A paper describes a structure:
Thyroid receptor (TR) activation occurs when an agonist ligand such as TH or similar compounds binds to a hydrophobic pocket in the core of its ligand-binding domain (LBD). This causes conformational changes which allow DNA bound receptors to interact with coactivators, mediating transcription.
Asn331 forms a hydrogen bond with Arg282 that anchors the latter in place and permits it to form a stable interaction with the GC-1 carboxylate group. For hTRβ the residue oscillates around a mean defined value, indicating a single conformation. The second strongest interaction is the hydrogen bond that Arg282 forms with the Asn331 residue in the hTRβ isoform (-19 kcal/mol). In hTRβ, Arg282 interacts, at the same time, with the carboxylate of the ligand and with the side chain of Asn331, which locks in place the productive conformation of the former residue. Therefore, the stabilization of the productive conformation resulting from the Arg282-Asn331 interaction is of key importance for hTRβ selectivity of GC-1. On the other hand, the productive conformation of Arg282 with GC-1 in hTRβ is very stable both in X-ray structure and in MD simulations, being locked in place by the strong interaction of the side-chain of Asn331.
Author numbering: 201 to 252, 263 to 461
Write the structure that this text describes.
């Protein structure tokens, strides 16, 4: 009864089914999402003399923690039954597709305006310049800009969880075989997501559509990291890249 409810002007909140789904995804996020309500005291600021060509000292610090952050993204998908309902091959294509998007979202929401830093793997707090010089180049700006911009959105774990699921179920991923099914899943997430937002009633105008634009920028970040990675594989040798990192980001 969606279109009609809208047209009148009712902002529909989550159904019982959608609430169930919401709790499934939220729990999944929070389990694979390093610490909470206290991620700040727990962060250790990277020595300012690191990351002032790829600065290999900085690159090295990032490559140590890049594997756990990646595995936590896979852990998140594992805890989603719809993800399980998919074939070996689609699952892998989906993970490779969304990995940098989710990691980057996760780094973005842990942006702190005071220190002007982001937190990686829940522990490591870096500045724009550090992350840029450590290999990300302009991908660092993109993540920092996103993080500053998201401050106003006041996301909760549930909103970040849903956003993650939407990223995960992207049927445009090349080589997929589950297009129709992956689209059914995403639509299902987007629908719970919007109802959750109606229920949350943020005092930001056009919240929903503004949120959707964030998704797009996260895809831009992913696509761009793909290109950065090519640049790195020339400004550093394969040797420096953790095996999982290579698994995920190179065809
Ligand atoms: C290391 C790292 C971890 C991360 O995850 C945070 C977490 O899952 O909470 C999120 C981001 C954006 C990064 C930074 C990063 C992400 C990708 C990448 O290729 C590089 C190279 C310089 C090694 C660094």
């Amino acid at each position: 009864m969606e279109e009609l409810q809208k047209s009148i002007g009712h902002k529909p909140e989550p159904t019982d089914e959608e609430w169930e789904l919401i709790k499934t995804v939220t729990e999944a996020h929070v389990a694979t999402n390093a610490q909470g309500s206290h991620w700040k005291q727990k962060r250790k600021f990277l020595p300012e003399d690191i990351g002032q060509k790829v600065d290999l000292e900085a690159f090295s610090h990032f490559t140590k923690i890049i594997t756990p952050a990646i595995t936590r993204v896979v852990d998140f998908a594992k805890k989603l039954p719809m993800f399980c309902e998919l074939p070996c091959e689609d699952q892998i294509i989906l993970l490779k597709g969304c990995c940098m998007e989710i990691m980057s979202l996760r780094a973005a929401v842990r942006y702190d305006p005071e220190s002007e830093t982001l937190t990686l793997n829940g522990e490591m707090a870096v500045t724009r310049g550090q992350l840029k010089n450590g290999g990300l180049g302009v991908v660092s700006d993109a993540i920092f800009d996103l993080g500053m911009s998201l401050s106003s959105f006041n996301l909760d774990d549930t909103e970040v969880a849903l956003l993650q699921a939407v990223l995960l179920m992207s049927s445009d991923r090349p080589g997929l075989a589950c297009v129709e099914r992956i689209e059914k899943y995403q639509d299902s997430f987007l629908l719970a997501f919007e109802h959750y937002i109606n229920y949350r009633k943020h005092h930001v105008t056009h919240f929903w559509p503004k949120l959707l634009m964030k998704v797009t920028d996260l895809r831009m970040i992913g696509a761009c990291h793909a290109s950065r990675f090519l640049h790195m594989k020339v400004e550093c040798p394969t040797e420096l890249f953790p095996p999982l990192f290579l698994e995920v980001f190179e065809d």
